[PDB]
Structure formats: structure tokens, C-alpha cells
């Protein structure tokens, strides 16, 4: 009952499967580090070069808070390779339902510097402060899959990332610092003001978040039938062809259709070193450019096209106890460049940019083909590494919001849970007792999935492991103890991709 | 109780503020004028020149009815400069809830012509007819902000505008009158058939209209965070850049995004005198061209661009008792040309037209960028002069309807209230007792607004008056008794613009 | 019951006396005139000369509203010469308790211009708007005794004065109009917005106002005993004299006192034509000077000193039906200059400015002697022409507020009652049916007075009429029908002055 | 339940706003330092030079106690820049209602000296003693805004200031120590005698203080109307001018007034280095001079006058964890000299010292103009940095007590809360285990404010942030983590000043 000697919680990483629900528990050992001597620091990049290949080319401004926060949003955190596979094979679609988070077994550790080395001792009376931003008072970090994430493997040690945000930024002018970027719209947030539980070793903390019924689904189903061949093949139609003429038997493409595939925006890949951002498809927003790559999903037969396919880095191996990743770029040699192939969009999605009449009875490739009524398409295939949910920035209006990168749409998402070491001052100016805290977090997510059944007589496709992945230690720990997960660059292995199960219609 | 000696209503122009609701009362003294000797008159413009700079260049046909109608739809009518400011500072968003309208203290005045001048006497037994088109039997005039509007200032005398409408119009052919424009689709409406209360001096009239819960909101919130910088700045992401490469720290523009800004249609401004309408962006509809200017809102740093920003005239001063405005063009020298700047869209809206891959690894400016899934944008900033609600013409299908001009979407709007002087004939052919009626209208609108609170630690922006506006008599009556309201041409003063309050996310 | 044929109220001007209460009814026939074509007009004086003898030498800015208001605040309105005398003789002190106001028998009269002359006809359906500013929403005109007042005599016809106010004024700069005077603090008030009863001939209007128990008293008592001789004359005192020495018998002035008289500010009178305002005692406030004349009351034997005694104009005669007085200066030859003698302060108030030690055992005249603890004084004698109550401008702090001019202090005063003719438009721009309204107002004020009894054996002083006043038609109507009231310039007749009755201690 | 492992309280810094009440929570991490080896020490300054520019020029004597105390009295501690702004815009006036104080999460830390450096370890059984002086047994430190204050920013670490006081002091004589200053009136207070809770890590401490209904208000309202122009501008008055003559239209300054502005004491600024204190306006008290600067508030157009305007230092930046400030003068280069402009007193307060009749019909400037009856004035504008309440020293009599420096009057204020580390002796003479304690304090203050509404039709003034303040990190933490708050010397930014909202009358 709060004594330093009884444990405040238990470690559970097991997944329980219901008929249409999954409960996944992610328990991690988390290291909370004092951030910037417990100081909010104004941070920004004045330079607004907007050129590819160079860091700090986008002007931005904001504050790094002393607080650390929990980022569990990704699929690989909550699903083992085994459970993900079951999910891929078993469910047409799934969505998160609730997330329960426990923080317990809190240890504030004092680091003491001695000649031999650092000495670690428990600070029994030391507290950590924890508050959950249910209200959305503080800026949400909505960008998916940063290094802020928990490890996929239970045994990985999690260092809560330092909470920082960007605020309203002016277009930079010459010979001026970051403050110049700040304006009357710019917002400084002091997390410290918010009521936050102060926790000692005896204490436990939990919050609960429930997703609204309007939460988006992640779809594992692929169409069996081509959308352009929906006809009975044995019968002619009264309908004319595209050109206006008789619709010949077995020439469904020529025939007019009651529907069309989703919108296609022409996309390009640029290899020019230090090219201007506006070289790539996108648009200027504020003082900085925003790109639309990859854009609306289109089926691409080709294995390696950056613009068309979802592309992201995956760790080659994942070390069990990596240091705090604040301000550290992922090493290129430590990551695979993985592209998610859209060949699973073969039945529904358009392969290439649309041709429409340009002039004089000619059709031109459509650089931007927006949504027109009667358009039907499938989403980009989701992946294991994709966020669970994607929260779009609040705006007046959005159109059929889907993240190309991944995640399922949510009217609202779990608010950030902020954890910070309570500063223990030494009684001397600018000096604090050097302390970090370790605790165990348990993220328990309830899931909903729709079971998928096959009505086709013939054998159907299941996703199975392969020898090359096993011999790559995929979903295993290698000889060095590192957790491999994705084993290869290029086309992301079929295991981690959704849109597998076969829907009839 | 109906006697000519007791008043049938009271004058209230006060605004009452609830926690989340506002009740605004607009009381005006209205002059009802006999229209065209109580005759429905076929009116049309045969010429369909479709060229800028010349009146009657659009072919149209319809009828001017003897009836007059109430047009209270605009914000400046129902909100004083003081109340509008409170609304701008206090509320994130607002919408109309109900509108109650009273017509009372009716005076039918006989005008008698004598050598000295016109003599005015009360016609005690004279009636006015009033009916409200709740059913939508008669054509709705949906076009926002015509000279039909009530004055913003309570003391202004309101002359009900003559009700006229356009109907189905044929493309005009040479050597033919307006009748030729009429076709089998053309609709003549006789208001007189509808049951209408006949009212004497003793009588009072009221209707009530309640907006559906589906009514659109007018949004006063501005995003603090750039939508392209939503990431934690201190952390790298697993995500690749736009080009497919490593996403550098502090170069958010290069990074791929889980969302994109709203659609951008390239817009142009033409200064060519008497230029063809098709010169401007738009499309042909029926026999006449329809333009899409300003189009989807985009952030424009520049103060004066007609196509990009909402542009409308505001009165320089507003006289207290202007004559009936039927068939009178607003004098150019009596109006300011006001453009609503979109610089408040800096965080969310795209600054310029999108670039998408054209060919050979090149990106071209997109003349039309339609909505594609995952697009998020903010509406054009609303203004004090904007209509309260905008009712779109009935059609089978509409897409995310928003008026660039202004107003909030309504599944239905208050039906027109038609008021006409009952004709008093002299017993001689084509001769009527010359009479107008004055009455007091009270438009009581219940409003809903969402209170806005700031969670940012630092000081936030409020909209305040400035010396230049005060010294322009803004929201005041000048030395001549005229009510100034908007004091300057060009960029419309920040007071009258919405999207002020700061939303966190 | 609201018909044009039954009267809506009765005329009562009688005063009813209770044991300690007086009810006074002031009924007047009021003419309500259309003001400035029903237009709020910005009005100001840019010139800030601040020199005596010239009009518009004080910079000010504000608006004249279309509204007219009721000003009944003065004693001569509510008390006949007979009742005032009874009050002066009977009561030590009095204060207003409640005020009830009826407006009834409303006639809207249309003025028609014909060759013979103006023709007057009743506009039966015409309304007047009346609202009482209980809330204090609109600026209070607190300045006592303007030409806005009702006549003292019941038969006088009252024209409601046009409501105008001054607002925050900037210090004027060269080559600029009144608008320049306006600033961000300046306040424009639209009376029209406020809910106001619209009244026809049948209608009656009433409000009630109750004074708080904290309302100030007007004091009719004079001290019999000199405050400096409070001792038993037959006995020596242990107390030393002022100089520190033995206090001789019958030399009370030499003796030290347990109290001192009220504060004395040296005052001067300047006869210099066009002298700077700062010549007179006072202080600069805002961009304009404010004078402190007459200042704290001091007893002055002399009959004619402007600075020391309350000085104001009284009408020589008062015509029964004077025209509207808006913007008309009182004619000098039509007024008596009346000074209220302070010789009644003989027992208590200090005759002249205090001497205090300057240096080297010398005493100098004190130009400003402020309040010091132990100071006791009597107020300046109140008069018949003095306001009933004086409302000071709202401020954070006030010190023992008393108006030298007159009136009794009130935490709050009856809010202005605004009456305006509802504009009747002709249907033509800037043209209204020419109309004024006449109605009968009844101001019923309940008073509280403390009965005064004499305990002195010998005969006491009563205030009686004199032959010279009777032969001046004082409190009478003269041969021409004019109501004389004050009959002489100089020392105001003893009849109209308070501080008569003799208090023992 | 008291174990070292469960936390004894939570951190809340949030502000909750009621309709007319505000609850502000100030939570700080406090460092309690052993003071002077737990010894009461007689402290005094024998020198009584009474000359400007040199420290210890005022003779004083007293004791520094081993105890530390809580000083939370200032506005910036309890209101974030955001909440202060809301308060400034929203409320006419406000006052503190209750203050609740929690002290919890107490850590006694032993400091151990080792060759490497100081080693910090928790002393589990160590106590701190806390007692609140509700009774007023010990001297109150009433002087506003010393370095004893908590930080305005939640994350700032608070070091409780050592409690010391001054007692009755004799005028010093040559060749004598501080003891000579002590006399029979001098009072030594031993805090140790008072019952005080001894607290270990498990323990929590709280007190509650409720302000009496007689507590003073801080006023945010400014008069719109000049007090010298309170008249209806369109009407002449019966009242004479200041000089005794006809009161001209639009020359309100010339007119006599029913009230006068508050008292003005002539004030001067002296630049003479090492000038005698008596050079400045003030008076001798005891053996030391007391100055009256700034004195009664007067409106000053000029931006920089020390005597007339409230003047105080504000930190340029505020470091998060400054060392104990006992006996440390604020560095001049670390502070802004801020003067609070009185230009907001334009409507009510007198601009300059009063002129009153000197002699021979001449008026002289009044060096001291004390309160005379009928004087009305506004207080000096309050500021964000001003104390919450100001407690005057107990005396027999006070007159309309207001602190020019700031704060609201209180019949009584929260008694000092004294916290001291329980001395842990080593068993050796004059040797104690070196220990300090850190704890978290929460100051929860309930506030009352009167909501302010505008009745003026035109736009009104709100206080908004400006770009220069944002680009100064006002209300933000700068790049170095320091909390800027006031960003400029000279005129204190309009954000932090009260008397904003516009009262009608
Ligand atoms: Mg066929
Ligand atoms: Mg990177
Ligand atoms: Mg004697
Ligand atoms: Mg005059």
C-alpha cells in the first residue's frame, strides 16, 4: 500500500484474442531523463533554405519542454510478429478501441559522480510528475513514426522522448535570430502549470482513453474482381463502349463503367542533389513548402518508386537499450529504406495518371486528377510499422482524410502523457541533484477487428514466414541480442503489409 | 387590443449574451412602398454580351412582384461593432439558431399631392399584407449582400426591397424581346395567391424560424502550429523526405506529410476593359458564364489581389434614411473596395497553386487542383459584412458546400417574408390612392457560439479598436450623422475579420 | 383601455406632507421634438483655448443623440414657494426617497406646412419611444442646473432637452477636426439599441426609482453656539491657551480647542478679460483645466464675493412656454446673478484662510488647507434652485463627497429617461413626416425630512415672505403671466436659502 | 499514508475561471536552506547617513531568524501572462478571496563534502518545522516586492527567504555598535517558541487564510468621460463660470464643478549624487527620513518621470534556479527600470499640481494639496508585478489607505508561514549535519472579480500581445531557458497595466 517495498504493478505483454476483439499489452521499462536542466528552451531554425539534402532548411520555431512524453503509436509496438501475422490472416479490418496506460514501479535514481565512475542510488523520496493531456491543452505531436517511439520488442528499454513543439513561425529575415520567427500568433505552452500527479516509488499512475466509434479502420481486404470487369462475361451489354460504339464481348476496358477508380496526382522523383523543394510535387504553406508525395494510392507494378509507394526507414536491427535519441538523426547505415508496394491495388486502383481530353480529340496525361463523383479506390496498403492512428491537424474543413503514411483516422487520439523528473535542487544556483527515473509502463490497447472468411472454393492466400526472414532473425533476436524485425531494404517484406484477405465483391 | 391608439410592439435592439448563446435584436423602422402600381412585371435582359464592364451583359428573365420582402441576412445588421468585437474575441465559432421576426406599429400613410407639396396623413383602415414563405413556394433570393439589406445601425430607416426573381432563361436570339427568353421551364410566381395576413394599424405580425442542428458554423479560430511542422522538432523520423531520402532534422517541409492542405484553383485577375467573361476563371452555365473567383481559400501574403481574396464593396458612410434602392447601382465613390486578407491562413492553407509532376521528372504548376483524400484546409476568413447564412440553390448533389463570399451553410434558411401595401383603388382605372406603409420590424436571432479559451502561457492576440478607426468614426456616427462602419479601402480592417482566436492543434 | 378617447393619466401637482415625509408631484406638459432628423451627430469643440470670456475654449467631443430626456433635478421644480418655505421652517434636513415618473396623455402631432402657416393635426398611430436607463448603460449628465430643467411652475411647458454627451477627448492638434479628438477610449453610445417602449396615444409609461438609504441629506440646521466657545463661561480651564499660557476667562479664542473647523482653500476672483483659466484656482485635468471654485465653505460676511460663495444665475422671470433651449445660451439680461451668502456659517465655519507657522516663529496664510483629523464644518447653505441630488462621476476613490454647487449625495440617482419621437418617414430619402409629440409627465418624489423642534426659551427665527418679494411677484405670476421666483440680483433672498433652523449643540 | 514511498501531494499550477471568481494555483519547488547555523542574529545598521546613492545610510536594527518564510505576494506569481491578460480584458476589478497553501513532498537532503564534490543524500528522518503566524505574533514584512518573492513562472525554483525583521531603533550615537540602537521599545522575537508542525518526508502541511469582505479591490476600469465635462454639451447652465461670470457653451473647464479631482502633492526628482534624503519630498520619521514619492496619482503625459509615476525594477530575464538571494542586491544590469504611466488617468486625475489663490488676486502652484471634501480621483494603475495585497503597519488612524506602489488594502493579510530545517547536530559543538530541505508548495488563491461589459456602440480597446513582446519572449522562455516577462526599460508595457476596461460614468 504505497510502501517502497511492495511493487505497484505487474508486467504484461501478452495479447488476448476475442472473437472480434484483441487486447494487446505493451509493457516497457522506461527511462525518464532530466531534460535541459528542467528548462523550457526556445528552439527554432531561422534558415528557410527549402532545399533537399540539407538539414535545417525549413524555418521553424518552438520550445523544448523539460517534460518527456509517451509515444506508443505504431503497430509494431503492440503486436508481436506472431500476433501481427494472425491479425493479417484473420482480420479484414481492425481499429483501436481503447488504450489503458499504467505507469508503475517508479524508481528515481540519483546519479553520483565519483572518480571510479557514476554511482547509482535510489532516491526514495524523489518524485516524477505525470499528467495526461486529455483536454488537448498542449500541442499534439501528430507526425507519425518518429524516433520517439517505443521499441517493438518487450525487452527494449524505452527512453521517453523530450516533449518539444513548433509554433507559428514568421518567414525569416536576414541577420536575425529565432525570436524574429515568433509572432503574435506564436504560442508558448508551459506544461508545468497543468495539474500533474507527483509520484514517488510507492505510487502508480494510470489513464484510460477510449476511441470514438467514428475511428477509422485499417483494411486488410483486397478485391478479387477487377473493378473494370464487373460484368457477366457471357453476355453483351446494352451499354456502348468508351468511344460510343458497340461494346464487344470480353473487352471490358472498352466498355463504359458505372464507377471510376480513385484520384491520381502525377508524382515524380528527383535525384538532383540540393534541389529546391518546389522541384517535388507539393505546395507552399506559410513560409515553407509542403509536399504531397506519395499522394493518392495508385497501383504500381514496379518495386522501387519513391513517389508512388509509401517509403520509410526501418531499423536494420533494434538494440535492446539504446541511449536517449533526442537530437540524434537515425544513422543511414542502421536503417533499411523500405517501400510498400501497391501491386495489391491491382483489382481496384488505377495504375497510372489519367488521360483526359486535352484538345482536338486528343487525350493528355492528367498531372492532377482530383476527386470526381463516382470515384472508388482502395487505400495504400497499411504496414506493421505504420502508426496505429493518425491525427490530422485541426482545421475548418478536411476531405476524406487518409494518411498516405499510415494510421487510422481518429476524431481524437489519446492525449500525450507527460512525464518529467521532479527537479531536486542542490540549494545552489543552476545546480540540481543529478537524477533520472526508471519506471515500467503498460500500454493496454483494446482492438476491434472484423473476422474475415473466404467464400471462394479454391485455396486462398495466407501470409507465412519464409526461410530468408527466419534466417535473417526476423521477429527474433539475433546472435548479438538485437531484434531484427525488417530484414531487407527495398520492397518491404509481404509479412508486414496489409490488404491480404480476399473480399468477394 | 387592436385599437389604433395602443402600440402593437416595442423597440429592442439590445444583445443579450448567454454562456454559449447570444440573442440579438434588430429593430428597424421600415418603409413599405407600393411597387409598380401593384403589378407583377416581366423583367429581363435580352442581351447576353458576357463582357466585363458593361451592365445587362448577362441574359436573364423574370418578374418583379408588387411585393416587398425582408432581407436581414448579414452580420453587421445583428451585431453592433461592440458586440461583433466581443464575438470575435470570445468565440471560436458561432452559428444562428433561431430567428424571430415581429412586424408591428404598422402605419399606412396616404400621400396627397397639393400645390405646397406632398401631404401625409394616416390611412387608419389601410392594410398591409404579410406572408412568410416557410414552404419555399416562391423563389429564394440566395445571393448574399445586396442593397436589399437592412442598415447595420438601428436608427437607419429600412425600405423593404421589391421582390423580384429570375427564372429559366433561353439563350437570346436576335431581334427578339425578353419573352423569347421565357421557355417551358420558366416559372411565373404569383405571390398574391398565397394566404397572407392583412394588417391594419392595430395588428401585429410575427413569424419564427428555427435553424436545423446541421447549420454551418462560422469559425473564428486560427491554427497556431504550421500543418507542415507537426513533428517533435528534437527527434528524427523513420519517414523519408518528399524525394524519398533521409528526412533531416528541422526540415519539415522536405518530410512527407500525413495530410495535405486544401485544393487550389489557379486564379487570375484581368484588367482588360470590356474583356470577355471567359477570360476570367470560371465555366459556362446555361447561356451565361459563371465564374469561380475567388475559389478555394489560399494564404496570400499580398494585401491586394482580387482573385485570391474575398473582395466586396462596403459603404464609406451609411446614411440614416436613404431612398428606396430599387434599380439603383451603388455609387462607386460611395463605397470602399475591401479585400479580406488570407494571411490568417498561414498555418494551414496553401500559399500558392500546387506543383505536381508534369513529365520527365519535372513539376508543373497545377491550374486546377481538386480535392484529393487527406486534404485539410481552413475556410476563408469570415467578416462582419458577410451574410449570416448562405443558402445554395437546390441541386441533386453538392460537395462540401462553402460560400467563398461568406455566410454559414444551412440545410434551410428563413423563408422570405413578403410585405406589400394593400392596393387602395380610387374607383378609376389604373389609379390607386397613393400610399406607403411604415412599420417597425424586430429581427430577434438566437445564436450559438463556442467559448474559446487560451491554453498558451504567453500573451495572446485580442482584436482592439485603433485610433485611426475611432478618428474615422468607425462604429460611430460622424458629424453629419452618417454611420461609418468600414473606414478604408483596400485591406479590410482587422476588426471585421474572423479567424482570430488561437486553437492549439 | 388604450383607446384614443380615454385619458391615460391625471394631472397632479400637489404636495402631501407626512409627519416626516413629503410627497411632491410635478406634472408638466412636455413637448418632445424631433432632434436633428433622428440622427446621432458627432459634436465637439476642437479649440482648447482655456481662456475666460470666450465660448468653445474647452476642447470636447461627443455625440448629440436623436433622443430627448427628462431632467427634473432641482428643488424649485418639486416644491412651490409655499412648500419650500414650510420645508425650510419645518425640517432640519431632508432627502429624496423615491421618484415615480408617469408619462401619459401622449399626443403625436403632425406639423404640416401650408401657405397660411403650419397646420397641426394629431397623428393617431404615431409613437414615441421611451426607455429609462436604470442600468446606467448610457452616459449620465451629472452637471447640475442646466437649461435642460423643467419649469418650477406647474403651468410651464417643458421641452425635453436633446440628449448629448461628451466622451474621452484627446488634446487637440492644429489643422484637425473634432474626429482627431476621438481616441480609443472615446465611447459612442447608440440609445436606439436599448429596449424602449414604443408608445401611441392610448399608451402610458411609468418608471420608479428608489434612493438608497445612503443618500445624502440637505441640512437646514444652523449651529447656535460658536464652536470656539463651547466652554462654560463661568469657569477656568486646566487647558493652556494657543500660545501655551494660562487660558484667561472669557477669551475662548485664545484657548486650545478639541476640534477645528473645516478645510479652507484660498480662493480668488479674477476680472481680467480673456484671462487664462489657470489664473483661477483649480487644476489641469486631461487637456483641459478644472477649477475648484468656490471650494470648501467658509463664512464670509461680505455680500458679493464670487469665489467664496455659491454663485449661479436665476431667471428674472420664467415664461410659461419658452421654445426649445437646445444650443441657446441663457441671455444675460434675462438672468439674475445670485450669490448664496455663507454668513449662516458664523457659528461653525472658518471666516478666512488659515494661518500656520511659516518659519522663524511666524504664521503665514495657508493657500491650501486640506482636511486634517478633528476638523468639523458645515456645508454651504443649500438653495431652492439647487439640484435635488448630485451624482459624482464614477471613480476609484472619493473623499467626503459634497457638491459646493448643491444637491445631496447619492450612491446612485434616477437613470435618465429617454424619450424620442419615432421617426415617420415619407418614403423619400432624408425626408420625415414633420412631427413632434406632447405628453404630460408626472414626477412624484417621496421625501424624508427630520422635523425640527426648538428647545430655546426665547423666540426663534422663521423665514417669512417680505413685501419687496411679494411686490416683485416672487412665487407668483406677474402681470405678463411670467413666473418671477427670484426677484433680485446679488445676495440671493433669504427665503431660498437653507441652514435656518437652530440646533442646540 | 505517511510512508516515504507515497507522494504527499500533487502539482497544480492551473487557473480555473468562474463567472465572477478565479482560482489560481501556484505550485513551486522550494528550497529551504539552513540559516546562519540555526541562530537568531542581531542585525542592524548603525550608520544613519540618510543620503541617496549609498547603502546602509538608514539606521536600523533587528534580528535575522533561522527561519525561512513564504512570500507569494505579487500578481505575476499567481497569474500567467495569458491569465493576466484575460483578467485585464475581462474584469473591471478583482480582489483576493482566500489563499490555501499546501506544503508537501518534503525532502530533507544531507549535503556531504567529499573530495570529488558535494554529495547529496536523502535524510529520511529529517524534519522541517512549519508554523503559520495567523495570530500576528511575529512582525509582518509588509514591504511589497522584495527578492523574497516566488518566481512568476511555475518551473522556477523557489528558495524561501530568511526571515528577518527590524525593531524599534534609537538614533545612533558615535562610537557605538548596533546594540546601542536597541532600546526598551525594541522587540526580539523567538519564532522557535511558537508551536510548529515538525515534518518528515511522509508529512504534508497546509494552512488556509480567508480575506475579509472589507478587502480592497484592484480596479481595471477607466473613465470614458472627462470629469470636468459632465454636462450636456447642447445646453447652457444656470451655473456661473469659475471666475463668477456667464458659463459659455463648450467651455466646461471655465464652468464650476460639483466635484474636484484627487489631492496633488508637488513631487520632484533629484539627480544629485549622494544628496540628502530630505532633498526629496518626504518627512522625517524617528531617526530616519520617510519619503512620500510618488504620492497621490496624477495624470502625466510624459513617459519618464520618477516622482510622478510608480517606478520599480523588473527582471530582464528570470533564471529558473537562482541561488538563495539573501543579502544580495539585485544587479542593475539584470533589471529593467519600469515606470507605470498615468496617462490612463486622463479622464479623472489632475495632470499637475493645483493653483490656489496666493495673494492679491493671484494663484500659486500648491506644493501640498491635501484632501478636501468633494475630491474624486482614480488610483494609480495597478500592474502585473504589483503585490496582491498591501498591509499597512498597524496604527491608531489611517486615511483612505492606498499603496502607491501597489496591492489591494486588507484589514488583515495571510500571516507569514515560517519554514525552517530542523537542526541536526553532529554531537560536536557548533557543528550540524549540513542539510537543506526541498519541498513543493502550492499556493491556491480564490479570487473575486467583477465582469466588465461594454455598453458603447463603437469598438472598444482590448489589450493584445504585440510582435515586439513576442519577439522578446515576453511570457515565454528564451533560448537560454530564462523567463523574460517584462522585455523593456522605461514605460512599462501596456500589457501589464490595469485601468483598461471602459466604465460609462
Ligand atoms: Mg455488343
Ligand atoms: Mg533522418
Ligand atoms: Mg486660567
Ligand atoms: Mg451661459
Numbering used by the authors:
A (entry chain G), B (entry chain A), C (entry chain E), D (entry chain F): 27 to 531
What text does the study give?
To expand the architectural repertoire for the parvoviruses, two aveparvoviruses affecting red-crowned cranes (RCPV) or turkeys (TuPV) were selected for structural determination via cryo-EM representing two species of the genus with ~55% amino acid sequence identity comparing the VP2. The VP monomer for both aveparvoviruses retained the basic capsid architecture with the conserved eight-stranded jelly roll motif (βB–βI), which is extended by the additional βA-strand and one alpha helix (αA). Like other parvovirus capsids, the surface loops are dominated by the large GH loop, located primarily at the threefold region; the DE loop, which forms the fivefold channel pore; and the BC and EF loops, found at the two-/fivefold wall.
RCPV was first identified and characterized as part of a 2018 viral metagenomics study from the fecal virome of wild and domestic red-crowned crane populations in China. Following cryo-EM data collection, three-dimensional reconstructions of both aveparvoviruses, utilizing 405,850 RCPV and 35,131 TuPV extracted individual particles, were determined at resolutions of 2.66 Å and 2.35 Å, respectively. The short threefold protrusions of the RCPV and TuPV capsids are primarily formed by VR-IV and VR-VIII. For example, VR-IV was significantly shorter for RCPV than all other genera in Parvovirinae. With the technological advancements in recent years, cryo-EM is capable of generating high-resolution maps of macromolecules that allow us to discern fine structural details, such as water molecules or bound metal ions. The bivalent cation at the side of the threefold protrusion is coordinated by identical amino acids in RCPV and TuPV, including D262, T263, D272, and A273 (RCPV numbering) of VR-IV and Q355 of VR-VII.
